[PDB]
């Protein structure tokens, strides 16, 4: 199941508008938007979330007319595994609860596997043999990633290629869902039919999703207890002291704490 909600996207003839429609649809299934803090929606709390509400599926197709279906965890927007035909593969979980939860995905698939690696960027970068800094994003990279995921089960994709493919999907789908800024970066690449690696503004934002989510949620009025350092496109560092500059940048936060009074507005 695969009775979880499914959102479809194809790279074939993809446009700025079709990509925007897709990311907006993904956000809509990740969270109801009923929990908002300082104008920014929060994903559902993992604690107490029923398994029938835990995942959504993204069915990706490309020009080669190959399809794969990614599973995303609504509590963190991240890719946890995928199905291609009669085989499904999952990142290695870190805890029993997550290991148990993924058994509820793709339950009719003939062949199920857990990868001998986790899906966090450190691990995927190590396997890929490159950092996010050197892995190009765009419609072209996504097209290739879909083919690579598709050919993995039959022995046709080596692990470093597979890891690179996951890094591409994760940033173009999960990180784009989490951040309007990164959705915008991907829109620009599609607009100009361009492939290019993410600059430091994107990578530091990705890394900081957790600490930004904590800083915003722990604030009564949106001012941070401690500033958080981000980077500009040219790599220079700056400090963020409150939520205001982040409202146009972050689309969704991971649940970190119950809302202090007034933090809902």
């Amino acid at each position, epitope marked *: 199941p695969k009775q979880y909600p499914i959102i479809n996207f194809t790279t074939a003839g993809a446009t700025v508008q079709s990509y925007t429609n897709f990311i907006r649809a993904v956000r809509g299934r990740l969270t109801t938007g009923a929990d908002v803090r300082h104008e920014i929606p929060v994903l559902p709390n*993992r604690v107490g979330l029923p398994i029938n509400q835990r995942f959504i599926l993204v069915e990706l197709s490309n020009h080669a007319e190959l399809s794969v279906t990614l599973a995303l965890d609504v509590t963190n927007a991240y890719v946890v595994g995928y199905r291609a035909g009669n085989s499904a593969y999952f990142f290695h979980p870190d805890n029993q609860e997550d290991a148990e939860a993924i058994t509820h995905l793709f339950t009719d698939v003939q062949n199920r596997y857990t990868f001998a690696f986790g*899906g966090n960027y*450190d691990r995927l970068e190590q396997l890929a043999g490159n950092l996010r800094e050197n892995i190009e994003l765009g419609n072209g990279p996504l097209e290739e990633a879909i083919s690579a995921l598709y050919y993995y089960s039959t022995g046709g994709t080596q692990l470093p290629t597979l890891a690179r493919s996951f890094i591409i999907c994760i940033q173009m789908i999960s990180e784009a869902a989490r951040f309007q800024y990164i959705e915008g970066e991907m829109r620009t690449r599609i607009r100009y039919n361009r492939r290019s690696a993410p600059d430091p503004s994107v990578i530091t934002l990705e890394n*900081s999703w*957790g600490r930004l989510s904590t800083a915003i949620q722990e604030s009564n009025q949106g001012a941070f207890a401690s500033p958080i350092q981000l980077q500009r496109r040219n790599g220079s560092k700056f400090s963020v002291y409150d939520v205001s500059i982040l409202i146009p940048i972050i689309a969704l936060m991971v649940y970190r704490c119950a809302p202090p009074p007034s933090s809902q507005f």
Partner: nanobody
Amino acid sequence: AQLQLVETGGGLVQAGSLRLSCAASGSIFSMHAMGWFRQAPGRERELVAVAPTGRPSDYADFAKGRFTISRDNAKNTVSLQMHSLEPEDTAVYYCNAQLWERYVLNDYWGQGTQVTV
């Protein structure tokens, strides 16, 4: 299972060396970075040097040349060798460990060690 950070090597010193060290224990699935920050009374907490996985060490301007960070990825230890210390470097020094957990990067902090110059 809970991450613990144990800091060593603080103390009193005078202008012109001192070495800090931190060892992490507990369930560590993926350590993205280990580093050292510092905070003086009446000032914000600030980065001194950080060693992110797979990348060059990142030093604050004031640490360039003077300080050297050293991370042992296998052992989850990080040390900071400081030379040419000034009174302006007086602060509480904190070890920072950044761990990927459930696909989110979480910060953890040592209890802090006083350095007085």
